[model samples]
Target chain A: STLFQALQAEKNADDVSVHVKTISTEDLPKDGVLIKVAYSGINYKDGLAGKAGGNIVREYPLILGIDAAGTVVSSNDPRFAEGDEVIATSYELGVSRDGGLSEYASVPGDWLVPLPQNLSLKEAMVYGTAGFTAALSVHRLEQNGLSPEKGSVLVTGATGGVGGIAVSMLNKRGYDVVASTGNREAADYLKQLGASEVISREDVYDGTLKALSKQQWQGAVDPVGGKQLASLLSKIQYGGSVAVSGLTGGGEVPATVYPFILRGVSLLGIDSVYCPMDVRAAVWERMSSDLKPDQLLTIVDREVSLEETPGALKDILQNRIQGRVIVKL
Target chain B: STLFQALQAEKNADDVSVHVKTISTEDLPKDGVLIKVAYSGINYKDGLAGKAGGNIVREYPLILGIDAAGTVVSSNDPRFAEGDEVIATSYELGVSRDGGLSEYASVPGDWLVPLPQNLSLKEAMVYGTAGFTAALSVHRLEQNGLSPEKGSVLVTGATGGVGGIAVSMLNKRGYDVVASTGNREAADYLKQLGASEVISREDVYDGTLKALSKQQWQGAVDPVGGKQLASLLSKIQYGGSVAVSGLTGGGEVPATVYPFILRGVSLLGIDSVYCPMDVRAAVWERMSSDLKPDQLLTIVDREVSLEETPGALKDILQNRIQGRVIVKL
Candidate 1:
């Protein structure tokens, strides 16, 4: 058994705390394949998992990285063998069981995705759950009849992890991307990442709410849910769709049925957490091909070691982190 | 010009009256193809078009039938020719222009669908706009990944025009259907139309509104929108969808985003009015084949001549009509 360092979230009395400590392979859950972790990434949910009252982690003393990319060190399953590179995210990873952000990780064979062609383990972690979620959103919107020729597509919360990646992916696919962010300062950064236009959050969701509004974008990738989503639904063009993934804005979406029935619009929900294995692999394959942005590395705000992950997680909660924060294990 | 008898809605002072009258070919709009209508069908919209306060009719003295099936007398476009059997529904018919329910109807060539093989002019009208809308709903649902293997599908307003036809079509496609109707007495009738289970409207809506509830049906076809739709959205299984077409229940859909963000449910809107010609043609072709029901005639509530159309139209507005009412020219 090899000794390795892993970040764990534990509860002591009424307080919750996350810290890193040295542990052996025996301390790891005794199931699935063992992987020598190379990289991991920080997501909004990861930020919550580390907080005392985040309500994300169900039990205490659990590893806290939801996204990991590494090479197999040992395996009990025949599907994967030693030295095979793989990517794993979502499902019960980081939430219920042990996760990434460690020198070594043990994950179920079913959760392992063969590192797609044209992508490396480091690049895979650069994407992690945020990038995968963005890819899933675009994939769903396209399945629902979205095309570059329809018109511009809006990506809300443009400065955030999922929104930033989506803007880049849609742009790479030839769509005219309109990035909407609350931080006007990130307009230049968004454009550099392939956004055709950058608008303020207020531009997307003004105070006035209408049952139906003038048709604007042909499609939208919305990570900021709530009232803004309702407003965005109203503005989608006829035969258009919106792919909703997050609820950073709010959980309550007060919407009318007018846009849906009259305009032939659709609202598709995107859930990366429990996404089936087949779809998860297909999306990763796409991310390695056409959906892979030319400036994929530009979305990385910073790269830090496992020792720096705790501060980076807290930084994401403070909203100081833009795009993705990759952790090199 | 040949003289033909037609049913028209006329407004005198503040009163609206629908009656049968004789007219010349010169009275028909002379654009697109000239169709010698063989059969027409009455939908709820046609009923509204004939009533005094019905908001559907934009002009007076309009021929009141939204759906027409017949042979092409002449066509200005090369896509269709004289003597070509065709089906035309929606897109300004029976509302802002001279429609079916008449011996002659001149519709835009783009609005014409070549009567698919395995269907006759009479049979086409038997299905009509109500049946066409139902088929479109099922088609969209299938496109959105609804499959018989998933689970039973719920059809709201099962005794109504769209609902009854959807029940039959889904059953013919090998799906298990649960029909929901306000008429408790029609339970047997719904079962005869291939509904595996017939439940009351209360079984579907029941006035209970929760953000999220136990996952129930895998999919739903709802022509009855409103608060009931809000309630239905809460109970859909994960990754399931609801295709909504009508506002009979009401126009407002007060819903939360929990089902969408958490469960990955989709809300697909069905608008036959402006559906693209390619999809319209495909749906009709399916209705003539795979979607055609064995108990097709069972959904026809009654058949009436042009002279009796006014009374049938009035009956539909009063909610006394069940299934579809076919009109013979």
Candidate 2:
């Protein structure tokens, strides 16, 4: 077998700055199965790790990228064999261990999800964490009784990666989606992604702490926490639910139980990390099928090579990017 | 067939007081099915209704018992037949309509539950609203992932009707039961009802607003609300649940989202009045079988005759009753 090439990050001369460098197959992390990488997507967390010392990576010098789509080259585990296409994301990859951004990589056999039948390698990377998480939110929302007949479902922070994908996915599924965003310029884009209506952040935050308000949305997928999450909770319909996934707005949520007791609303917590494997597999399957948005390819606003990742990283850390970016091998 | 006899509460024109007078079956409320009343239970709400000028009965002449167990003597609906044993409670009975305070009573068939196979008519009345609500709370708790393996389960308002039954039921099902009560005199009573430990209302409420606290109960059956409900939310274990039923303390609940997001705690809202019939039937079936408490009969503190109903109501309204009261017809 020929030695596959991988782009990796290395410690600088002072061991302070990390610099991108090329490495051979033999130099990859020790693991059970080897994969020939096709594509890897960039996440906001990944960008933080790649620039401005966001402290996301555990090791000083490591291969970086939390998500990758590729074909298995070899496996010690019986579940996988040579030349099987697969997708790997979340878990130890790109956090405490070396990960995808490579022409070839090795990972634990337990972490690989057989590439869903409806998706190709290129299409899988486009969905990545943003789309997968959006699917997870929808899955939970449905589990908590968010049906198509229910009133409008709201997607907050609708211009960002996860938010944008969520809006697009919800729209495609026939949900009357209200996209809430501060980015006035992205209104048309959000509409194309199935937003029935758009509202500015200023309009929703009233500063008053209401015990309960007139029900607005039947379901909500909220990525922005803080006051925005609080306001959403106040306005959810009786017996409705809100699937919450992020703390970008702020982590603190001052709330009351009136919504839960009087209206039968649920604030469902969404954690992509450490989600049960069975559920993770089902979510990936839906992401490939029913949850697959028509604007799936358009969600990847940019594609960069190994040398261009550092600049992309800095852009994400400054919050200058919209949607997701993929690193092509 | 002989005419069924019942006691109807009518205003005494001379004294400005209420008096119970015998009535023939034909004199009962319209849209009522005649039942040979075998047993009835005294609830705190029922007690308040029985008082003179209690605002419970809207009509000048009405019956005052809210719950009844009996054999159906006749039916307007074909689903029931003569000699069929049944349980009837809730609906507008004892409030705006004539209820079950005599040897023979009539009620709307919609408010009746065909007595489950294992539950005797007398035992059904002994459980009444208190046991029915407890089983409902436990069902909701179980749906939210409560299990006997997850440490102690708390029953708040432990000396009260619902709490006493909940403590006994949870204990029989292998849960380590902790009873919370304000009555210092009823500590031994709670322990005898199968509580493994006894705690005070003051103890559970003595905590600051913490985003997340030490994991405590796996499940809770709460009758006391307001601050007590808020306190329970903060201390529930990861994936634990609390079912909120009564609002004896108050309805307002001040809370934060930390317990939900960080520890996966769920607050289940229990409304028995509007519960779907299928779930109601299921809970009743559980009550008759596995969840049937061993101490069900022992919780019956007294059995009162129709003549003694007035004084018993006053005793319950003053909070002087320890356990439950069954009315023998």
Candidate 3:
């Protein structure tokens, strides 16, 4: 009853190794809640956990997952109790501390999101951080007047994680979604995710930029921040906004004030990590219901046992990973 | 009763001139409402109207002045009625058409904001576009989660029209107001306008910019958009937002994605020219009640008569004007 299985990583000088090991409850650091993890997921950061100088693991022999979906075994948080379903993502979960790709996890109760109705443990990890990110972006855009009737919403990097989910969620919310991707080969996949149409990355943003351009989408979800974001912003309809979350496209944003001062365009920044608890919970409810992508198994590549997590992490680093992969404990 | 005095502008090849002259109401462009102008305010655009190639009055011989407050003499728009006290500003007024710098002006009813209770014609002109821009900026920031208790709010260009009013309105809303200006001479003026403290322009934006700096104000009102805006954005507290309206500082907004993607900061654009009627009315209500800068004679240097407007307009461009000057007809 006191032992659990987990994927753990450790380092000794220059040597780094990861193993699916058996651990005792006594080995767990004292935190806010004891969670019996039902599922976990692989991420780019998880892939970096086992490599030498990965540095993702703050301490030796810590957990190697950033997200965990499970049920509470015990808790110190007044808002939570034993036997409650919950979610723990980011905030030291698997980086610098123990994480969720395990049979059990010790986490600060503050990070636990009540597994809102209509979502299952397996489903939670499938969406995992990517879903939360996309959900958060959609919520923020809507909060800023992005509506279905406003016009089409452009999703940059549509073939990627957050981009795919944003396309799906915005579509579910009745928005006309135009998916933009560097890889046109995924055009079919994007359209299937509810994109009304898919366009080349160059179509959304050529190499050129302007202070103001022909008004295009009423709103946009941009994970590909870079010079491209500068272009995307110039094309937004008056009073519209573009919610940006990442810098995959690069970092520098060279823009002008004319669009902002003349068109009333707003730029909303979305950060999933450190998002407030109140907004986090409200977003989860949305993900569990209206924003939920179903069949739901469509987006997830497959599920693996905790013992298989090591290989999954390796696969993700080596490009063997295509869509999301769930880890069952 | 058939003819009223106005400050009219005309362009003749290389000649441009403005004069206070008598004209029949029929000289006014056919539009929605005929407002018997009680008060008009001078703006930078109005100062540009009398110069050769000023182009502010797109059509030569147009009335000059972007903002006016008055009682309605006639209206075709059902939303407005005769005798209604109103404030009209922007929306091509004083630009491509006849404007409010006249004893009477024909304005589209949509451009009219019925003077809210607790404010009179004279008081309305005192606020005018400067007050509305500041109020709208405050309202947008509040909508984005800024609160008096959150921390201090920063207002840039503290000596200018919108910046001064923003500091005042935000202070009236109970926020800790920090005013920043390049002109140290206005420090006492800013303090008297309810600034909790006054700072030099460099204090707000030293020439250097960072991707992310030590967190500063909870919210900011920026009428000065340029490299300084980029510098200011880097210092906003997590989850805080900056509302920008003008480009007095310059136009290029050289920024990075780090502060936004990392701190969840937002850049809200404030454009008062075409602000929706709903928001316009709501803002006016706030100006009349809580957001109103009391007595407010502190900001206006003087009120000029209709016959005195030509000289006042001339003074504005020749560095002879100091603070806001009101024109009464």
Interface RMSD of each: 1.2, 3.1, 0.7
Model 3 residue runs over 4 Å out of place are A11-21, A45-61, A76-78, A294-296, A304-323, B49-61, B314-322
Would you list the clashing residue pairs of candidate 3? Answer: A58-A96
Ranking by lDDT: 1, 3, 2
B212-253, model 2: which lDDT tens digit per residue?
Answer: 667788778988877677777888876677887777786666
**What is the descending TM-score order?**
1, 3, 2
Please tell me the TM-score of chain A for candidate 1. 0.98
Compute the lDDT for candidate 3. 0.83
Error of model 3, residue B266, in angstroms? 0.4
What DockQ does candidate 1 have relative to the true complex?
0.74
Model 1 over residues A49-144: C-alpha lDDT tens digits?
988887688788788879989999989899999999999788888899888878888999999899987999999988889899899889888887
Interface RMSD of 2: 3.1
**lDDT by residue for model 1 over B226-274, one digit each (tens)?**
8888899898988888999888988777767788877888899888888
lDDT of 3 at B191: 83
Question: Model 3: per-residue lDDT, tens digit, B1-329?
Answer: 49888888887777887887889987787768999987898876688777876544566867787899988998888889899988888877888778888888898888888888898888888878888898999988877789899888899887677887788788778999999988767778888888999998899788688788888897899999999999999989988889999887778998788788888988988888888888889999999898887637677868888788878777867655546788887
Q: Which of the predicted structures, 1 or 3, would earn the higher DockQ when compared with the native? A: 3
Model with the higher DockQ, candidate 1 or 2: 1
Docking class of 2: acceptable
Give the candidate order by descending DockQ.
3, 1, 2
